[PDB]
Symmetry: D2
Subunit: 308 residues, 4 copies
């Protein structure tokens, strides 16, 4: 009877890629919001001008005003600073904390009932910021990070074996880089565990390339970071809510005892559907995987205690 509404805060490469992925799925009308005058308006009109050629019926508009986001079903935060050389990890956390706080207060006011998906680095912590500033219940606040790590690892496995991208699957817990918990046991090619298809040496190498995945694209582009794959990872989450798909994906979810952790967001396997985070799946981990998850959890917990 009426199409749902998605607002994307940050009309940069990742925000505009997300709008592109969502337009082709015909899942919602889209509002692109950004502080820079003219930019979201132009990307929005440009994308909508592809509609007659590409077949899709969705309206894409741009604003510099959070009021344009009123009555959104899903709001995606793609805005944030990247770490400049001569900038502490704490300086990144403090800058992005202020960015995510201000965006969340504005969007939670214009869409009190929204689902909130965060991308801003560092992701597990920026999800906590969004959670506490919005006042939304836990099922309505989440972050993209595990789907992107998973997507890169699947890509490297598929190219290494030369098999279909559709047939390679991987669950990854934790965050990006050193906070990541790859799971070879939860990594399959057409149902076949990857440990049967690649030697340990090659799996460890592909795991290292996954940990360094975002940095590898930053090195090749030289200015700016990845946008196609992060856009796609977010588009999957938006669509899993709007079409009630009950996807089983790794997402940054608020924990209240799962994996022995309370009071933090971590990258965990969830059922994602029309009521948002519908279930957190607690899977079997080795002592080593549990200890890696716990260490990543401890780092997130002590970063939170330093937030304004």
């Amino acid at each position: 009877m009426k199409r749902p509404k998605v607002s994307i805060v940050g009309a940069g490469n990742t925000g505009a890629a997300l709008a592109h992925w969502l337009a082709i799925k015909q899942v919602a009308d889209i509002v692109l919001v950004d502080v820079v005058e003219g930019m979201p308006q132009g990307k929005a009109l440009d994308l909508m001008q592809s509609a007659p050629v590409e077949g899709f019926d969705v309206v894409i508009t741009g604003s510099n005003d959070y009021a344009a986001t009123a009555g959104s079903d899903v709001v995606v935060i793609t805005a944030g600073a990247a770490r400049k050389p001569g900038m502490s990890r704490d300086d990144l956390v403090n800058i992005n904390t202020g960015i995510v706080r201000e965006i969340t207060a504005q969007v939670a006011r214009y869409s009190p009932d929204a689902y909130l998906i965060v991308l801003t680095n560092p992701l597990d912590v920026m999800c906590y910021v969004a959670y506490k500033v919005s006042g939304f219940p836990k099922h309505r606040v989440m972050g993209q990070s595990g789907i992107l790590d998973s997507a890169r690892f699947r890509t490297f496995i598929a190219r290494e074996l030369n098999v279909s991208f559709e047939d390679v699957h991987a669950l990854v817990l934790g965050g990006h880089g050193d906070s990541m918990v790859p799971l070879p046991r939860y990594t399959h090619v057409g149902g076949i565990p990857v440990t049967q298809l690649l030697p340990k040496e090659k799996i460890d190498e592909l795991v290292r390339r996954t940990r360094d995945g975002g940095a590898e694209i930053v090195r090749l582009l030289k200015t700016g970071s990845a946008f196609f794959a992060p856009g796609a990872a977010m588009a999957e989450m938006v669509e899993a809510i709007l079409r009630d798909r009950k996807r089983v994906l790794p997402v940054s979810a608020y924990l209240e005892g799962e994996y022995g952790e309370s009071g933090i967001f971590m990258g965990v396997p969830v059922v994602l559907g029309g009521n948002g985070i519908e279930k957190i799946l607690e899977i079997e981990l080795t002592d080593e995987e549990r200890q890696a998850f716990a260490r990543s959890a401890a780092d997130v917990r002590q970063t939170l205690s330093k937030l304004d």
Copy 2:
């Protein structure tokens, strides 16, 4: 540039459903062939008349003459007799041997370079008949069986857990019913082994329903067999070839030592691509599983002995 050509022999519900699944993928022009005058012509013109509405550019024609199939990249055999009341195992094998022989001789004459996909039951046996009558090298001859059993098992799991159909995966070896070799270890939900999510008793029931899956659709329809999901399973195999996808799928493939068997077709994991069966994947089986495969193989081998 010219679109590839696929011929479908048997324009019953299954052949037509396959034509439908192939048309929407925009993967080839499609020729439907059948002995029944008017039927392939009428179904072909109907499906093609959907093109302006559904937006695909595919030409679909019907014929009663195997000449219409000349120069096909792929030919799919869906034709065969229903096992009628009081008809023995051996009578069906004998009727369908003659049907498959006559069709294969004709399609091999008009498309000496084609890939051949068989659906006719009993499927592992009919694959052998088509292979010997065609004279085609083993990489060009294969049967659809495992993808359909895999699909039904995945459906039942997805509905049991109420999760996305996209996120449940299962490898099944062997043929339908009693010759089927389910692999719980090779069955996952979002990378999570299904043994962590469903009790043994439930998994066993879902396996029994999968063995019985074709008969179940038969009992409900009362006349005729499944067509939608057999159609979709065949469409995946046709597309895997035409688009060089290198899909990792269970398909009936000619063995010369793989899984300790020679001189028969069995349901095994393959890499399916632009050169047909490009690899047979040899996976870890338990003693029980290897024995169940050995039994399925012996049964196939004795059927082949009786007939020519």
Copy 3:
């Protein structure tokens, strides 16, 4: 968020083909309903078993009970009888009248706010039956006819010129066969009026093939009627509503003054969106075209005059 619900009454070739086209669009969960025990259950389960292979997340179920249709956003009626040996013209219509009335009373009870789409022939008359039995307002009741005639005409033109099915467009008014009002002036190939690309005699022969298009498939199949293209045309209408697309399509709509007619369904150009028939567009017609539309309307009133209203 919850996916919308579509019920299809009639689980024959066209009902099942419609379910298939809807499933690949991922637009709704689908309930198939038929009187024949097992059939809708069997077709639904088979189609849903394609879902892990084909990538779609929708639940398809079947029932012999109209209660399974409760709370449908869209209900599509595909059931109806074809003319038999020894059966009169007026008997066929009376039999379809009964079938549509019984279905409509059951589906309007279980989904009082639904949009209702009718396929049953004779299509404009059966829409009027559905409209009166349902008590639904006029924006919520409509029939599929013109899209299928448009699609056939477009397919014949595209095959004649050897051009993309995507770049041939045709607006067709009225019903099937003799009730159809084809409009060569509103028929285009990438924006080029088809009268610049095909001479008069060819256009007349492609119009004739379109008028006879349904009977052509019937002659070839020998038992049963077309199902792929009627299925596609209905799926386009169901989607136009559920995703509020505001499609500009020929559908059977209830007229209250449009084209000088009031009190009947006729095939006309509409804006079809999430509030159903949002607008009936009144296009420029020649005197002959207007007279052809008036005679098609008159044959609708001739058919209704014999029905137990």
Copy 4:
């Protein structure tokens, strides 16, 4: 069976948007080429990392080496300089003539059987440069311009009427801005000529906005130009060739008598298929349209007369 191969020269926003639209169609393996080290490599690997999530089987790679384009079925040239404050039409022609010449010499060497699609401004002139430098026959060289102008016009009409983007169609002849030939008679909504649905003043306004559409996006973005829609327009042309769709589209094509002109590229309606430009359709023009097309032709011919090739 092997997937076809498309190379894209220029891995800026437009080249990258093109690769995205092509990846989703699953139509070809893609190679991005650019002079800037790391950039095509990064965009390629980023796009290909979306594949497991979006369900496409296409390999996307990036190179600074033209040799990586060897054996392409289609090569798309998206590279070129934009007009900066204080450079004449002549400066732009000579700069872009130098860029397209160096690109065409390389890509024509590595793929002597390729179809060449040009984006580089000014488009009709830059197509003649690619045609002359490649030595390819006329069916194998073409430019994207009319599809983008049509798409913008169709977008403005659809949003003015609040109707489906799928049901608004427009053929546009000639090039961008003042060279554009809008055709209200070849512009329809669900088959209805747009002159029946909008007053002439509003049409005239949507035409002015179309002539200016390129500059409008540049004003809003402030750095850089449109990329999504130009990307989609080029993707439609690439797909038309690789799947032999025989689409009926406005493209820049080499004329040898058509529309009264020889020895130039102009924006004309073509059938685009597996053999590139398979036909040029000669449509009915009013005196004013014929005169505007002739003036633009004379202008293009004069610009060609001053180039060395």
